Write a protein that binds this ligand. Structure first.
Ligand code: CA
Ligand code: CA
Ligand code: CL
Ligand code: CL
Ligand code: MG
Ligand code: MG
Lengths: 461, 461
């Protein structure tokens, strides 16, 4: 029956036990076998039933006056009980396993519909929901967005993950925030028509041509990470950008960014950058990511005195001293570089995460007073000493120093060699071109703990 | 392949996009296409991936060193990727849609397994998990618990929802906390063997005989609500009870509770209680529920001066004044009684929820200084006046008074009658045995708002 005709136990109406328990509370009852009438059911206008392990919403069709529901983070598959709930204005049902959204098709009073991370492919049922202003369909398996073409009140939209053809967006000029992350898009030409866009998230697509963005001057947040960008000249137009993510592309020429002085967050990791001089004027930056590039000279960063978070890992940097002037720096990552001298880092007392593994660091004494550290990385240093002559009996000084200034004794020594402060000594009865040793010393500075370890190579001439 | 043989993109290993995104963060990467090695995967020992909209855990089989996982509140169905993760000690996977737990069968290092609110019927796969000390299977569709019989290290157990036969519990004498709520149990005789039980939750079963509990003197928490209890004499043995729920039964004789002086929470709603004198000595009570009984004389509650929460709704109480001495009372519910005089409630200034609809209340002035109220209910009062003689022209005084002391004018008047302060007047040209009027006045006291409304009936002699 489409109505409750006699006072009926809650657990006969709501057959999912988790929903029945929720409804007991909502309906002001004390046991799921308590009876309710249609009138009692009609009092319910909102339902926040997220995270409850609900697998079925059978029974919800009797809650005729629902206007807002949240069933996010459940196990919903079948949503047919919503079909006739036409007073619904907002639905939150992200993080379920819904595939068939035909039951939404006549819910034309919907203004908000959140369905991200379900199993939806066919969005044709959304075609007539023309009052929508928020529609979230990211992390689904949609390939065809034709059904969106009439949704001309949309302000916020996302969808995924199989879309190639964006042409159905052409008339959606109200759009302000668009998230097309994780699709199969190369052609973003339609986006030039969406001149009200303030946020465009397009991570992990196949985009190489960003000229469509040139007239999108309202953009303040742009994520194009994980694409195929190289020429970013278009971005020079986008002077309202404050949050720009360009990581995992093929970019080398940063000159188009030089005038983007509102930027506060700039992500440029995993590109082909060797020259950051165009960044020198971006003095509002608080977060800058430059990992996995080809950097050696980082002197331009010294200008960026609002930085609190900086990544430089996986470069070819030997001179880290430009960061020494960044007083607000809280987290600094430069593992996998060629830094030997960390004397300049003694300045940085606001530092709480200092990650410097896989460098050429031999002496921790400059770090000794960095007592606000809570996370620390110093594993797997390596350096090669200047050569000395092969001799049958060769000695070199141990140079490895802990934070206290004490020498750290070798952990292993090659070629049968041995320690006694201060040298490492080898007897080499055969001709030999190299010897080496390692060290491995746990250390804590402030509250941050790591192993300071490394391999020292000594060429023999 | 059962191993990762070459550095492999995270999103090729973890095919569920939500899990891949989580794993990107766990593995210290910045894009789901970043590559990882088997060694990187082997660093992961714990995973907290609840509430993420994960539908598949494909890929988790490569995380060989996992010992603790939380995948609660997702959409998991198939858990075969766990089969060979034999270093697992704790799994939290409540609130999914798992049915087949065969993949757990060789995870013999498990000490904790939480699976409540899934779709599990067959628990035979748990048979050899003899190191379990916590096993949560409530809100499933289990009928046969034979597989539990060997799980002799269990301390905490729950299961549901089709169990009738509890005999497999007989040897589980380590059990301290058992939750058999929402099954089909009538025979709890086996429970007499579980003499270490401190908590027994058995809500919504078919229990009428609780004599098995007589030797379970370690019980401090007992929930038998929603059963078929009448004789509760056995409970007199259980002197360590502090939290006792007996709502929705057939109980009338409370004498067995009189010596349970550690009780702090006692729920007795929806029984056949008319005499609460046996409760008078339970002075540690902070919460007492007596709704839906046959109470008239509540004088014994006056002894219960630690009460903060009291329900009395759906009784036959006319004298509410015994509650006036309960200074700590925060929430008081007595809707659907026969209370006319609330003068005594002026004492209760700690009151924050006062629910008194469907009484005989005509004058709110005693409530006027209850300014800590935040929730208030005064709807649908009704009373019948003492009769007056039929006359062709009949008048009676309006007695309905708001918190301010002002008379509240009638909203409707029967039989064509009319108001002018102070009487309601009728012209009755035919013989008439009754007239009536209603009132309906929104009111706020402190921060609590309600409609003070009612129907006043005047018999004519
Ligand atoms: Ca309750
Ligand atoms: Ca990041
Ligand atoms: Cl250059
Ligand atoms: Cl009696
Ligand atoms: Mg951002
Ligand atoms: Mg309790």
């Amino acid at each position: 029956s489409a109505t409750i005709t006699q006072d009926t136990p809650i657990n006969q109406i709501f057959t999912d036990t988790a929903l029945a328990e929720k409804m007991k509370t909502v309906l002001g009852k004390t046991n799921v076998t308590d009876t309710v009438s249609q009138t009692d059911l009609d009092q319910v206008t909102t339902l926040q039933a997220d995270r409850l392990g609900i697998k079925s919403i059978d029974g919800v069709e009797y809650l005729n006056n629902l206007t807002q529901i949240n069933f996010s983070n459940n196990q919903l598959t079948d949503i047919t009980p919503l079909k006739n709930l036409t007073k619904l204005v907002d639905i939150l049902m992200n993080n379920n396993q819904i595939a068939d959204i035909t039951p939404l098709a006549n819910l034309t009073n919907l203004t908000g519909l959140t369905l991200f991370n379900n199993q939806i492919t066919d969005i044709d049922p959304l075609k007539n929901l023309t009052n929508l202003n928020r529609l979230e369909l990211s992390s689904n398996t949609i390939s065809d967005i034709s059904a969106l073409s009439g949704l001309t009140s949309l302000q916020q939209l996302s969808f995924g993950n199989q879309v190639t053809d964006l042409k159905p967006l052409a008339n959606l000029t109200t759009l302000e925030r668009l998230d097309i992350s994780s699709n199969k898009v190369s052609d973003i030409s339609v986006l030039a028509k969406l001149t009200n866009l303030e946020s465009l998230i397009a991570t992990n697509n196949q985009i190489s041509d960003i000229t469509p963005l040139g007239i999108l001057t309202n953009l303040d947040e742009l994520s194009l990470n994980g694409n195929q960008l190289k020429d970013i000249g278009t971005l020079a137009s986008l002077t309202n950008l404050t949050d720009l993510d360009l990581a995992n592309n093929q970019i080398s020429n940063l000159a188009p960014l030089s005038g983007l002085t509102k930027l506060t967050e700039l992500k440029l990791g995993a590109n082909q950058i060797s020259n950051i001089s165009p960044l020198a004027g971006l003095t509002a930056l608080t977060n800058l990511e430059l990992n996995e590039n080809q950097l050696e000279d980082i002197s331009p960063i010294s200008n960026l005195k609002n930085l609190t978070y900086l990544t430089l890992y996986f470069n070819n940097i030997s001179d880290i001293s430009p960061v020494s002037s960044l007083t607000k720096l809280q987290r600094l990552f430069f593992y996998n570089n060629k830094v030997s001298d960390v004397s300049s880092l003694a300045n940085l007392t606001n530092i709480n995460w200092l990650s410097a593994g896989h460098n050429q660091i031999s002496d921790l004494t400059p770090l000794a007073n960095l007592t606000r550290i809570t996370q620390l990385g110093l594993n797997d240093q390596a350096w090669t000493n200047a050569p000395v002559n092969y001799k049958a009996n060769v000695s070199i000084p141990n140079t490895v120093k802990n934070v206290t200034g004490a020498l750290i004794a070798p952990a292993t020594i090659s070629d049968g060699g041995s320690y006694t402060e201060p040298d490492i000594t080898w007897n080499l009865p055969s001709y030999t071109n190299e010897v080496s040793y390692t060290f491995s010393q746990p250390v804590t500075i402030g509250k941050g703990t790591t192993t300071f370890s490394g391999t020292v190579t000594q060429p023999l001439k």
